[PDB]
Design an enzyme around this catalytic site. Sequence first.
Site, PDB file in Angstrom:
ATOM      1  N   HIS B 207       4.499   5.568  39.882  1.00  0.00           N
ATOM      2  CA  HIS B 207       5.066   6.372  38.811  1.00  0.00           C
ATOM      3  C   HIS B 207       4.417   7.742  38.691  1.00  0.00           C
ATOM      4  CE1 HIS B 207       7.330   3.209  36.179  1.00  0.00           C
ATOM      5  NE2 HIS B 207       7.710   3.197  37.444  1.00  0.00           N
ATOM      6  N   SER B 211       9.955   7.252  42.510  1.00  0.00           N
ATOM      7  CA  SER B 211      10.388   6.555  43.707  1.00  0.00           C
ATOM      8  C   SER B 211      11.042   7.507  44.700  1.00  0.00           C
ATOM      9  CB  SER B 211      11.358   5.434  43.342  1.00  0.00           C
ATOM     10  OG  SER B 211      12.552   5.958  42.797  1.00  0.00           O
ATOM     11  N   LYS B 233      21.592  -2.648  37.292  1.00  0.00           N
ATOM     12  CA  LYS B 233      21.601  -2.751  38.747  1.00  0.00           C
ATOM     13  C   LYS B 233      20.625  -3.817  39.226  1.00  0.00           C
ATOM     14  CE  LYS B 233      22.272   0.682  42.367  1.00  0.00           C
ATOM     15  NZ  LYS B 233      22.501  -0.511  43.204  1.00  0.00           N
ATOM     16  N   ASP B 234      19.437  -3.868  38.621  1.00  0.00           N
ATOM     17  CA  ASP B 234      18.475  -4.914  38.948  1.00  0.00           C
ATOM     18  C   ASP B 234      18.944  -6.276  38.462  1.00  0.00           C
ATOM     19  OD1 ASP B 234      15.126  -3.548  39.129  1.00  0.00           O
ATOM     20  OD2 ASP B 234      17.030  -2.623  39.695  1.00  0.00           O
ATOM     21  N   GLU B 277       3.266 -22.267  57.229  1.00  0.00           N
ATOM     22  CA  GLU B 277       4.533 -21.915  56.614  1.00  0.00           C
ATOM     23  C   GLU B 277       5.211 -20.819  57.423  1.00  0.00           C
ATOM     24  OE1 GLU B 277       5.247 -23.975  54.148  1.00  0.00           O
ATOM     25  OE2 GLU B 277       4.222 -23.365  52.303  1.00  0.00           O
TER      26      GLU B 277
END
Lengths: 33, 387, 420, 100, 116, 116, 487
Positions: B207, B211, B233-234, B277
């Site tokens: 921040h 971005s 949107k998220d 994994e």
Amino acid sequence: VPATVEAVKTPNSKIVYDDHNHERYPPGDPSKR
Amino acid sequence: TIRNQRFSLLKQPISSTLNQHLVDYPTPSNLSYWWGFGSLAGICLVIQIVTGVFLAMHYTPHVDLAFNSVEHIMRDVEGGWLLRYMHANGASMFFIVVYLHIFRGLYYASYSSPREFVWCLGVVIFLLMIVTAFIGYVLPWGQMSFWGATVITSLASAIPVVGDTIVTWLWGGFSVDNATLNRFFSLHYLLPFILVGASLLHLAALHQYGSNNPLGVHSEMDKIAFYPYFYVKDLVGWVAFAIFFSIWIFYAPNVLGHPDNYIPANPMSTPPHIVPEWYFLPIYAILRSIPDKAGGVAAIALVFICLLALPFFKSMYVRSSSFRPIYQGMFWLLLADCLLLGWIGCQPVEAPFVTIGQISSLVFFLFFAITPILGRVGRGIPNSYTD
Amino acid sequence: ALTSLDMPLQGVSLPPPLADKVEPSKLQITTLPNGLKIASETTPNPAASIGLYVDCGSIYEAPYFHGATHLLERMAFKSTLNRTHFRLVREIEAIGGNTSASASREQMSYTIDALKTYVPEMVEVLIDSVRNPAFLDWEVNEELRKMKVEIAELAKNPMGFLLEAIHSAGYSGPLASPLYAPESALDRLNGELLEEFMTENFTAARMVLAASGVEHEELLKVAEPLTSDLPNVPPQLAPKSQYVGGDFRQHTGGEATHFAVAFEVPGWNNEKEAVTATVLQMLMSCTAFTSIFNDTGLFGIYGCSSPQFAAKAIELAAKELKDVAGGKVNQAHLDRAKAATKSAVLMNLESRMIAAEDIGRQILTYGERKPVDQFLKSVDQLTLKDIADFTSKVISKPLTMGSFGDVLAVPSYDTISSKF
Amino acid sequence: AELAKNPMGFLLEAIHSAGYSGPLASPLYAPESALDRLNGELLEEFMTENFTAARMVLAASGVEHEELLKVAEPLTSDLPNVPPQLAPKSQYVGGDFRQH
Amino acid sequence: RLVDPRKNFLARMHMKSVSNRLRRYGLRYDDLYDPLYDLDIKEALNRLPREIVDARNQRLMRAMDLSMKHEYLPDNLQAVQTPFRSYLQDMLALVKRERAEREALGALPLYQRTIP
Amino acid sequence: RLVDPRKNFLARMHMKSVSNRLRRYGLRYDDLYDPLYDLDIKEALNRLPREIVDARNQRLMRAMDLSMKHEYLPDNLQAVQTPFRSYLQDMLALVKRERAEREALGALPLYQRTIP
Amino acid sequence: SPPPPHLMPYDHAAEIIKNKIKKLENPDKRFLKYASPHPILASHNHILSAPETRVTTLPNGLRVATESNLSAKTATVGVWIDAGSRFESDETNGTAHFLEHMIFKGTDRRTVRALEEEIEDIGGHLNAYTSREQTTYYAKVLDSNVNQALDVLADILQNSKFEEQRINRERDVILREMQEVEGQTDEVVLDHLHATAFQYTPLGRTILGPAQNVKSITREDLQNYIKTHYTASRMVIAAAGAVKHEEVVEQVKKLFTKLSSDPTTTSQLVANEPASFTGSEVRMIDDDLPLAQFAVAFEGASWTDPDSVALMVMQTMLGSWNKNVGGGKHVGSDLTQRVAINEIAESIMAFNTNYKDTGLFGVYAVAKADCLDDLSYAIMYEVTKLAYRVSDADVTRARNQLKSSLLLHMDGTSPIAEDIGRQLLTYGRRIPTAELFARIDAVDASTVKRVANKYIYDKDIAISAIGPIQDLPDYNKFRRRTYWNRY
Ligand SMILES: COC1=C(OC)C(=O)C(C/C=C(\C)CC/C=C(/C)CC/C=C(\C)CC/C=C(\C)CC/C=C(\C)CC/C=C(\C)CCC=C(C)C)=C(C)C1=O
Ligand code: HEM
Ligand code: HEM
Ligand SMILES: COC1=C(OC)C(=O)C(C/C=C(\C)CC/C=C(/C)CC/C=C(\C)CC/C=C(\C)CCC=C(C)C)=C(C)C1=O
Ligand SMILES: [Zn+2]
């Protein structure tokens, strides 16, 4: 005359919005709220 | 203005920092759905903490009770199967969204200036995620829990002078036993809270500059507020992830793992197919390709040195792969190599898989060797391609 | 209620119509023992206008009071000793009133406008505000803070800037004291400096309470107990000013030279020859202005030119005054200016606010309202001989010149005074 | 802006402006509005017109003439000849300056 | 040099591919250079005439609006684009030369990047 | 009145104890009123003359220096102290009276405390 | 010993301020017996008597209305026409404004000079104003010159020459003003507001019109416009002052004998071309302007809608203010108080525009760039509050202020004549002051909340902003602030 200057000097009641993503409803239609 | 009266409650000191950092923060208006996996990773972290806390109310970290307490959760605890499956598969979900998060940054050169600290904090976060996931996988104390821990805690022996000393201090004895499982449980409770703090530093460091965007350009002229545009949107991505997560939880809860962990740990016998994994497979294939114990550990470290050194290489001034076609194809080859390394990792050590892993590890490292020279060549592009 | 606006609302009590012919009411005037003049006039218009006019202004400032009159205007209808500023505003708003205050070089005015049924409220609030100002420091400092900004936003208006400019440049003495004080006398103006200015200058023998739309009986009933106790003070002689002529120059750059040439004309105290000045003003951002006072006036002409065309415009204007003084005006042009003059004084006179101002204006200047009729006579009695000699006598006297903007191409005062 | 803190210098210019009409009345400290036009292109056009070899003297106190010429000559001979012009005439008149 | 379009046909394909991608947004190549990338671009961008910087900001806003809308420029507008008309490279090289001269003579830099 | 020292001897000792405590630091009782405690106070303080506030600010700095040093005012200075000489209460009452007038008429408050 | 209270400079200064506070605690009740800060709804119709507004309809449909005041020395006489830019077409837009220019440019009986020498000889004034829905030509003259002014008005409205060389000259004047005087930024904001709010309707068109139309206007076009629109049933003759109704009526039936006789009402043209409100915004961003100016509007009420009176009362409740106003921190309007106390605007004004079938209710504001965020909150907060919390005092004071302002603005022959003409065009009648006062008194707190819920609550808005407006909240922020989710 620049494009922004002419647009400020001349209000235009026949505004054409971008329609690639959203098509408008006909003007004078009650809101979809 | 003179703030004699009280305006919007969000601007009052009780909520100004949340308003400024979460609600009103300016965001480039052209962010794609690839910019929504940062929040998904935060939600995956929260799910792991919440399910892990309630799973730890029923789990016993003792070699005589660990396996049976996990079976007691699956059977006797009301809702226990879901807590265990949301956590076991949530760990897989965590690594999927973070891998997509990482590759988003590589494609758009999100590591480049002025966000080198953001990328460096991310690499540290990746290291903590691997450690947290690995020691958690030992908690059930199955066959792969025991033999997976025996290898990684032996990675220290490659050090010549104090290597054996570090292994036994790590083990708490002379073999993997209760002292190892008890200490892995305590560290598995503590590391996710460090992981929360590191993600907060990660978000704060980003921040400071905002971005990056798909075009890779200066974006101050077309920024909008995070709420509610990138909130909704998220939210679309959150609901889609919940569908994706639910399919794994409710219909394929055990296909992402191996059946061998359902056998209680046997220090005598050894499973003929010992693998980690799936999200550790690409690292594990890089380690296997070097036919030297010390060289293999050096190569694993070199992976994180190469990642940490990416932001600081002198480069060209263009960011996005949308305008760097050679770096674009260079990126799509790395992704195919990374997928190849994971598949090779699951394969046993025999021909032709040994050679394929050696070439694939070479191709992975060639990406970080060829990336800097491409910037040095590309800095002269504007002079060459004139009007 | 519910009906559409094109349909009459049922059940409304309608007052009976007024007659098409209503005899105008006489101006009743009452002078108090302290010398305070109370004058009222009844009208059929439901709106009332009550004003208080004080023989005071910028001519009573110099020295050590520079800026008091402009501050006093801006401190009007503020907190008093009997009611806070908040309660005062709420009292005026509750009756739908409006307040205004004005400070000239020789006159101060305070007016309230509301419906006729609220006369006791208007008089009480008006008298309290002018008689008992608190002049609290936090209220003065705010008006002082506002006064800075308006003075800064004054050179945006060259008409007003030049009109103030040629007053100090043309007169010597009190009339040269600026109405707008500079931003150095403002860092000295205080509440206690305003109280000393007002206690000595706001006296009963220098006040007029003029109302338009009220009955003189109850207007006395309310006003007398609030004003009878003012001390009777002797009248002082007005501070005398002398027209001397002068020049104003100021180079502020730009590409628009502004200009004002002005001369001396007799004041209101000279019956006639002050009418001729308004007819002359009508015979002629460029216009002809006029600024008249009790014993001296100022008649001039504006102008706006270019940096390099700022040499011929002044001579151009200097040629038009010569032409009028030479007798180059036709009777058609003179008659048009006469009709324009007579209509203007009759057209502003239907505004209730102005007619109340005119009552207070005149009872201070003369002491009685002089009928517009004799003014109209003195207008229609004018000849081309009177216009020509009035100008000839006016422009032979010392000259006043003002210039703002680019003044590099404007000539000297002597190079322009010799043209006349 | 700090011209108004030195009354002698402020009054010296304010009577140069008020005592002359022609070129001498042009302020030596231009008003702020006269600065929002000045730029490098204006400076070059002014300097090219007025800086001419026939209008410049290279005075050097404390050097031999041989070595001054040896260095200075190959740097100023390039300058072309310009038929000399006359300094504009200025007219003294009266005048008053007042800033209340 | 191999990056010369007139000499190497592979660089011709590269320039054609870069120019085509830039033309779809109405962006010049110099518009990809970010002030936040280094303090040299910011210094070079501060030294350019205002009208040039104003046009660059407008192209960036236009490109951002297209990218958000998932649109490209109309073909008529694309035909008049000049993706490799430069306005910044000459200024940036001049800035770098002055910076290198300051360093060689032992002087302090005129600016520095804030430690993130 | 119980709070009046002229009548209640316990109020006399209360005043004496408080007066002795204030005198030791050079403080007046009104100096204990803080602008941060209440918005009515800081509105009253802004309305006081500059000389009043300067003396109050200086008495506060002097007391803090004494408090930091673990020392009191010298006895020849304590004798000239005026602990209960008022400068703030009359203004504070007026400010509160004007706030009550605004509330009684439904007006908006002239100043509000921020929500912490 | 301690120093006496008047010895130290700070002790003496505190004594001075204390003494002055003491003299505010004892008011003299002589001055506190009539005025009160509590608003009371008064009812005084005896002072409401006004001269009769006599109206007469001629057989051709023309209407003559007069309010006689025979004591006055001056009169105002003029023509109000139910015509404007709304009734034009997309090809004749701007013909009404052009006709206003050419209306004083020549006749058979009088040329341009002869007309203006005659107006000056009598000392009169001629004024022409055109709007989107009304056009007016009126004369300000002395009592003895009414018949001359009526003669002039009939001459110019029935026999205008419209010479093509005058048209071309006036064409150059109009083209100049359309592109060189646009700095009237307040009317520019409302022009863009009408265009976006009433888009794709005749009401969204500007009065001035496009350049494409202006530079193609011909002799015929001005003549066809007069023929179709300046019909006898659409015009009103209004006179106020020293005028007799019967004298004026007989002058009208003598002089207005050449009007068009088309029997088409304005109600039919409006119904054929309805105006509708579209939620939208136009943002003219220019950081080079020192100040930002925006207007935010809701779709309002038409002239004959009974809720229009309540919208006037609600407009007074919001009120208006600028920096020069002295007591803005103390007025009843809570919106003004928020602006004045916090210094968040250079000026602010609430407006309520009406038309035949629609209207605009909103707030216009001028502010600095850094004040926009807080200012937008306060504007939306105070408007939305009208649907939730309306005190009886605030509605009683707004009713008293509206009653006072509507009658204190009727000073002069001119405001009374335009009132008669405008009201006859909008209401079909001149509403008596007693009735308008009764309709105002009907608007109580429950009425305001009901009307506000119909026009404000969760409704679409139109935004027109210009200047440094990056900090202005977007459409979704303004849209969300039309309801409160805590109720
Ligand atoms: C076949 O074989 C293999 C497997 O089997 C099936 C695998 O599964 C994998 C995959 C595994 C990985 C990728 C994980 C390996 C990487 C890491 C980093 C290991 C994770 C790290 C650990 C397990 C080490 C844990 C760390 C500690 C115990 C550190 C202890 C120290 C602590 C807590 C603090 C230190 C104390 C002080 C400094 C004192 C003061 C402290 C204060 C707080 C005051 C591979 C490759 C493999 O080939
Ligand atoms: C738990 C792990 C992580 C969390 C919670 C997280 C969270 C976030 C968030 C919320 C953002 C901003 C929104 C977005 O762009 O998606 C972000 C951006 C970013 N993250 Fe992560 N992240 C994590 C892991 C990583 C890792 C492992 C890396 C790199 C190795 C990384 C590198 C970046 C970069 C470069 C950005 C800026 C992207 C841009 O500006 O385009 N992150 N992160
Ligand atoms: C503070 C928060 C956490 C706590 C208390 C916690 C606790 C536990 C417990 C008690 C178990 C054993 C129960 C079981 O077998 O499912 C477990 C397993 C596990 N945890 Fe966590 N955990 C936390 C966060 C995380 C995070 C952030 C990750 C991912 C990086 C993770 C990955 C795992 C994995 C992979 C397993 C093994 C799943 C299995 O095979 O059954 N945990 N954890
Ligand atoms: C414009 O910029 C922004 C982004 O970029 C474009 C974002 O993507 C997001 C959305 C994503 C966020 C906030 C990611 C979550 C944050 C972090 C640091 C990741 C991990 C966080 C965890 C695990 C939260 C745990 C912390 C807690 C619970 C703290 C205690 C507080 C409470 C209980 C209320 C936001 C708000 C944003 O503004
Ligand atoms: Zn016009």
